[PDB]
Amino acid sequence: MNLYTVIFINILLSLTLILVAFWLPQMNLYSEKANPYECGFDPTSSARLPFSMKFFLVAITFLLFDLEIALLLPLPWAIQTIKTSTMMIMAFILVTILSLGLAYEWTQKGLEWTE
Amino acid sequence: RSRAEYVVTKLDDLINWARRSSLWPMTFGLACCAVEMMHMAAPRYDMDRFGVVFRASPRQADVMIVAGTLTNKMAPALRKVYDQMPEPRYVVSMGSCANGGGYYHYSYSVVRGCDRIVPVDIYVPGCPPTAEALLYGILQLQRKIKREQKLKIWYRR
Amino acid sequence: LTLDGIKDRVLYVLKLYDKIDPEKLSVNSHFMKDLGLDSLDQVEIIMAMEDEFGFEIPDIDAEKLMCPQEIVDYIADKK
Amino acid sequence: ASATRVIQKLRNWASGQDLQAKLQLRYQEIAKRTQPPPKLPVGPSHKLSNNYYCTRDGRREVVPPSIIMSSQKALVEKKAVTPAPPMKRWELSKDQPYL
Amino acid sequence: TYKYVNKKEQESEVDMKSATDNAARILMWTELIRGLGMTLSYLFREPATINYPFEKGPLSPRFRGEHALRRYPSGEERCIACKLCEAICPAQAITIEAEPRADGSRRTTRYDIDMTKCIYCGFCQEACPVDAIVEGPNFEFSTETHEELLYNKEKLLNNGDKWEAEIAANIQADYLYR
Amino acid sequence: KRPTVRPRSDVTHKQLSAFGEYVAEILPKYVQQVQVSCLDELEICIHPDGVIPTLTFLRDHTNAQFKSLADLTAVDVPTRQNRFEIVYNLLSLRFNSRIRVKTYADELTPIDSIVSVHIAANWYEREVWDMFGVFFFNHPDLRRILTDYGFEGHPFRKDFPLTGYVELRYDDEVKRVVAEPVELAQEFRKFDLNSPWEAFPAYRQPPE
Amino acid sequence: TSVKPIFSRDLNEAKRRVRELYRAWYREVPNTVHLMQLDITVKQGRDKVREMFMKNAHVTDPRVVDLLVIKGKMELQETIKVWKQRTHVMRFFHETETPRPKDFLSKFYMGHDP
Numbered sequence: 026m027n028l029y030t031v032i033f034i035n036i037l038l039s040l041t042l043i044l045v046a047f048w049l050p051q052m053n054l055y056s057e058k059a060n061p062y063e064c065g066f067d068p069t070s071s072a073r074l075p076f077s078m079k080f081f082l083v084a085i086t087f088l089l090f091d092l093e094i095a096l097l098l099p100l101p102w103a104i105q106t107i108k109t110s111t112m113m114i115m116a117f118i119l120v121t122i123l124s125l126g127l128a129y130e131w132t133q134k135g136l137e138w139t140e
Numbered sequence: 141r142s143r144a145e146y147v148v149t150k151l152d153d154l155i156n157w158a159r160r161s162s163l164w165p166m167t168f169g170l171a172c173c174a175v176e177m178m179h180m181a182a183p184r185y186d187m188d189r190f191g192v193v194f195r196a197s198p199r200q201a202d203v204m205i206v207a208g209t210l211t212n213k214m215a216p217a218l219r220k221v222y223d224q225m226p227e228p229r230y231v232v233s234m235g236s237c238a239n240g241g242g243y244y245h246y247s248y249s250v251v252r253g254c255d256r257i258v259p260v261d262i263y264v265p266g267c268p269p270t271a272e273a274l275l276y277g278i279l280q281l282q283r284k285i286k287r288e289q290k291l292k293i294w295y296r297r
Numbered sequence: 298l299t300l301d302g303i304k305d306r307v308l309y310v311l312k313l314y315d316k317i318d319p320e321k322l323s324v325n326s327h328f329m330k331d332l333g334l335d336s337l338d339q340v341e342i343i344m345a346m347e348d349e350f351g352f353e354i355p356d357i358d359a360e361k362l363m364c365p366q367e368i369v370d371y372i373a374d375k376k
Numbered sequence: 377a378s379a380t381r382v383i384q385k386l387r388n389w390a391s392g393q394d395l396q397a398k399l400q401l402r403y404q405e406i407a408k409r410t411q412p413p414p415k416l417p418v419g420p421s422h423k424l425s426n427n428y429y430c431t432r433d434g435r436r437e438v439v440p441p442s443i444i445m446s447s448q449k450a451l452v453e454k455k456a457v458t459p460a461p462p463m464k465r466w467e468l469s470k471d472q473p474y475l
Numbered sequence: 476t477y478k479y480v481n482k483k484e485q486e487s488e489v490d491m492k493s494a495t496d497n498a499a500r501i502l503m504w505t506e507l508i509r510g511l512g513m514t515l516s517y518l519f520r521e522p523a524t525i526n527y528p529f530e531k532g533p534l535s536p537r538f539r540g541e542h543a544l545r546r547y548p549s550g551e552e553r554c555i556a557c558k559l560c561e562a563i564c565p566a567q568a569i570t571i572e573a574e575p576r577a578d579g580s581r582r583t584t585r586y587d588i589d590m591t592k593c594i595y596c597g598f599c600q601e602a603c604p605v606d607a608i609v610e611g612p613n614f615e616f617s618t619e620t621h622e623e624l625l626y627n628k629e630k631l632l633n634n635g636d637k638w639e640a641e642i643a644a645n646i647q648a649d650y651l652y653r
Numbered sequence: 654k655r656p657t658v659r660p661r662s663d664v665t666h667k668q669l670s671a672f673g674e675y676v677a678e679i680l681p682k683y684v685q686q687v688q689v690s691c692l693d694e695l696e697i698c699i700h701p702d703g704v705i706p707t708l709t710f711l712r713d714h715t716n717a718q719f720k721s722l723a724d725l726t727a728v729d730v731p732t733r734q735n736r737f738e739i740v741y742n743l744l745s746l747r748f749n750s751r752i753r754v755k756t757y758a759d760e761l762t763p764i765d766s767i768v769s770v771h772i773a774a775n776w777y778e779r780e781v782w783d784m785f786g787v788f789f790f791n792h793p794d795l796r797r798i799l800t801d802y803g804f805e806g807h808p809f810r811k812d813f814p815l816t817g818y819v820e821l822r823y824d825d826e827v828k829r830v831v832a833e834p835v836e837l838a839q840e841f842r843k844f845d846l847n848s849p850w851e852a853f854p855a856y857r858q859p860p861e
Numbered sequence: 862t863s864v865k866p867i868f869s870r871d872l873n874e875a876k877r878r879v880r881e882l883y884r885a886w887y888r889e890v891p892n893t894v895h896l897m898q899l900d901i902t903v904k905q906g907r908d909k910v911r912e913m914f915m916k917n918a919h920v921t922d923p924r925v926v927d928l929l930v931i932k933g934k935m936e937l938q939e940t941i942k943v944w945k946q947r948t949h950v951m952r953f954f955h956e957t958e959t960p961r962p963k964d965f966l967s968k969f970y971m972g973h974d975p
């Protein structure tokens with residue numbers, strides 16, 4: 026209840042700040058005021074156009090690695106087990122497999138950016 | 141006078157104090173005058189000590205220091221970045237070029253003073269004006285916007 | 298080649314052209330000596346034919362396209 | 377120059393350089409702002425004889441360029457030449473050849 | 476002569492001590508630490524910031540500032556309407572009109588300097604044969620309108636009357652060089 | 654000896670004269686004039702058809718090796734039929750020399766671009782076209798480089814006025830920066846700074 | 862009276878290049894009006910293009926026509942790749958500039974300029 030209360034207090038504080046920031050100062054807006062910024066000239070094309078991504082393979086690898094992190098995260102409770110040999114072997118296997126995948130991608134130039 | 145008039149005057153003083161203690165120029169310059177402007181930014185004069193800090197985007201800028209020769213090819217861009225600044229904005233022309241064309245007054249490709257393009261609050265003369273002179277112009281602008289009476293005029297409306 | 302269809306859609310676009318009187322318009326009416334148009338008006342007409350037919354007409358045929366009949370038999374022997 | 381010895385030792389250790397010998401702030405070693413009056417010397421042409429201007433008129437010794445060949449004036453086993461002798465190779469510095 | 480800024484001479488071979496030194500340099504960020512130390516030394520130095528406007532940066536008597544028109548000690552204007560300053564002004568910032576005065580003196584009826592057009596080069600003060608027009612050391616004369624920087628003869632004579640105590644001293648300190 | 658006169662070395666003049674004879678006899682098809690100034694500078698005035706062969710020969714010949722184009726410019730002399738004199742200053746680092754190659758053009762005869770010889774000629778010829786209107790054949794992208802977009806006229810021509818024909822100002826009715834016919838609050842005062850007495854008898858032209 | 866051609870041997874292919882340039886301008890006008898936020902309509906832009914071509918329509922020299930085509934292609938490229946701004950495009954219309962009347966009485970009343 027207390028955490029929910031303080032989250033709501035933060036929400037109310039930030040909403041109050043942005044509300045007073047939008048309703049306190051004098052408004053004077055026209056077309057050139059609200060045109061988008063392109064260092065003084067008109068934009069040649071819209072910014073909603075496709076914008077090429079040179080680290081897409083690294084992003085997919087980040088998805089897989091983040092799930093490897095999710096697998097590795099119950100370790101502070103796993104170290105309390107009776108059969109610590111099995112836990113230690115399984116954790117070693119998991120981290121070694123993750124490292125081998127990273128090494129294979131590094132060898133196959135997947136970490137390098139395209140073009 | 142009325143008690144509310146005194147409160148309005150004090151609120152005007154507070155607003156003017158905030159706006160003159162926080163003057164952020166656009167990171168905008170054109171020439172040798174802008175070289176003297178970064179010599180004002182340099183450790184001797186310390187515009188940051190005065191509270192004056194450059195911001196690259198015109199949206200975060202308060203004042204625009206036109207420091208250099210405003211050409212015909214540059215004038216739409218200068219007007220654009222002036223118009224994209226938010227409303228409490230000021231203009232400090234710097235040097236003879238931005239004031240009245242200067243050494244290139246009779247040129248085919250030079251706007252004869254940036255006051256033909258943007259409304260100039262303060263003119264700083266020189267070619268180049270020293271960083272002392274530009275700092276003097278900044279302090280004079282601070283005094284000018286200390287003199288503003290916006291809430292008092294609104295109350296007297 | 299759908300000759301009637303291409304000729305009446307050519308006449309439709311020629312009616313849609315605003316500098317030509319639809320009453321004075323005919324299949325054999327010349328652009329210059331009958332309708333009194335300029336070469337720029339003629340090339341605008343040819344561009345209208347291009348953008349209504351979906352295929353490009355080169356400039357070497359533009360000075361030969363002088364009447365709607367020339368347009369329709371040209372696009373007939375092209376299509 | 378008003379720094380304490382503790383701060384001076386801290387600055388010198390942190391920079392690796394002896395900062396106090398070469399301060400970037402000028403204190404007293406600079407020239408005085410008021411100076412004795414000068415007496416500038418005169419040039420070589422400040423003499424009362426043998427100083428005719430026609431003998432030192434460098435501006436009027438300029439001649440029009442000499443035409444080596446012309447299509448109208450000339451109306452036209454030797455060795456091949458170069459615009460100049462080839463430039464001698466620069467010697468490596470004996471002071472500090474490498475950084 | 477010439478020198479190499481990045482070319483390395485021969486090789487240092489491979490050694491265990493050198494390999495360990497390079498390994499420690501890579502792992503322990505040694506050059507980054509000494510850059511931090513340099514910035515720390517600058518932090519503990521004394522700043523070079525003067526307290527403007529209560530402290531002003533140093534200048535010289537040669538300094539070219541706001542224009543002024545001087546006088547003789549009698550009070551007569553030094554200017555004799557000779558238009559040498561107007562002729563030599565590279566920006567054409569000087570406009571001069573003249574006529575004989577009521578006593579027959581050769582004096583200006585119009586002396587305008589467009590300070591928005593002037594380039595502050597001192598050619599007028601070095602072309603003046605009578606030291607009439609000068610660039611006095613005033614530089615804090617920024618205005619709020621464009622018009623106030625269009626000086627006329629009254630403004631320039633008032634500047635000469637205001638700054639004569641300093642301009643005369645600067646010319647006294649400087650005139651043997653020029 | 655004389656402290657006010659520039660010292661003169663005759664060896665540079667002899668070398669430049671010999672090299673001018675060399676280039677003139679190598680390329681008689683295009684070379685129209687060869688001169689060496691008293692400032693020890695070699696100028697070769699060629700036909701406009703030989704710009705590409707002359708520049709290529711000067712860049713790639715073993716005895717020339719003028720591999721660096723110092724600059725490319727034009728001079729407007731509007732009293733000859735071909736008013737634009739195109740000037741190429743070239744630098745030979747191998748022989749530590751400089752040469753000047755001149756040719757001519759008018760408003761309607763373009764000359765060949767030398768972008769295929771020197772890559773700096775791209776922007777240099779863009780500047781020449783923008784400032785004088787001299788078109789260049791086979792340029793990869795010829796357009797204006799210094800004037801405003803939509804600027805009419807070539808301002809470095811002699812007959813173009815100093816202030817131009819239009820001036821810009823911000824109009825608040827249209828909320829734009831607009832171009833107007835030029836009006837000056839103070840006209841540029843032209844001066845007649847020419848002495849009526851002849852200064853240099855060595856350059857006295859014969860009477861007409 | 863015999864000169865070196867630029868691109869066109871005579872007026873016919875010069876007029877062909879003119880027609881090609883007019884075609885390119887006519888196609889590019891709607892894209893310009895859509896891309897730059899222009900107050901004008903598509904009809905006004907094509908009318909302005911036709912007005913410029915008819916302003917230059919009196920020339921009969923193939924070299925001058927070729928140079929006019931080259932200049933028009935340069936301006937066309939400056940409009941295709943957005944280098945001309947809204948101000949640069951609207952400078953063709955002179956909407957802020959009042960026109961000088963062409964009659965003797967109005968020129969007499971205005972000033973001394975003929």
Ligand SMILES: COC1=C(OC)C(=O)C(C/C=C(\C)CC/C=C(\C)CC/C=C(\C)CC/C=C(/C)CC/C=C(/C)CC/C=C(\C)CC/C=C(\C)CC/C=C(\C)CC/C=C(/C)CCC=C(C)C)=C(C)C1=O
Nearest residue numbers: 166167168169170171172174175177178181188193194208
């Ligand atoms: C030679 O050729 C040329 C160039 O080439 C070299 C050029 O370049 C060139 C162009 C030249 C120029 C444009 C000149 C520009 C000058 C420079 C580039 C040199 C200047 C140097 C810099 C800009 C570097 C500055 C570095 C710094 C470290 C300075 C720090 C700056 C910052 C931006 C970071 C600090 C942040 C700020 C100042 C703003 C921070 C504060 C806030 C946003 C406030 C937020 C706080 C709150 C909202 C808190 C509120 C809450 C509360 C609870 C408060 C309680 C309130 C109550 C009322 C009670 C020209 C023309 C040229 O010819």
Ligand code: SF4
Nearest residue numbers: 172235236237267268
């Ligand atoms: S006024 Fe002088 S110093 Fe300033 S931008 Fe112009 S030429 Fe440069």
Ligand code: SF4
Nearest residue numbers: 564593594596597599
């Ligand atoms: S300082 Fe130079 S630019 Fe200024 S008025 Fe004097 S001569 Fe003219």
Ligand code: SF4
Nearest residue numbers: 554555557558560603
């Ligand atoms: S040069 Fe001196 S004396 Fe001559 S007109 Fe100018 S100010 Fe007067």
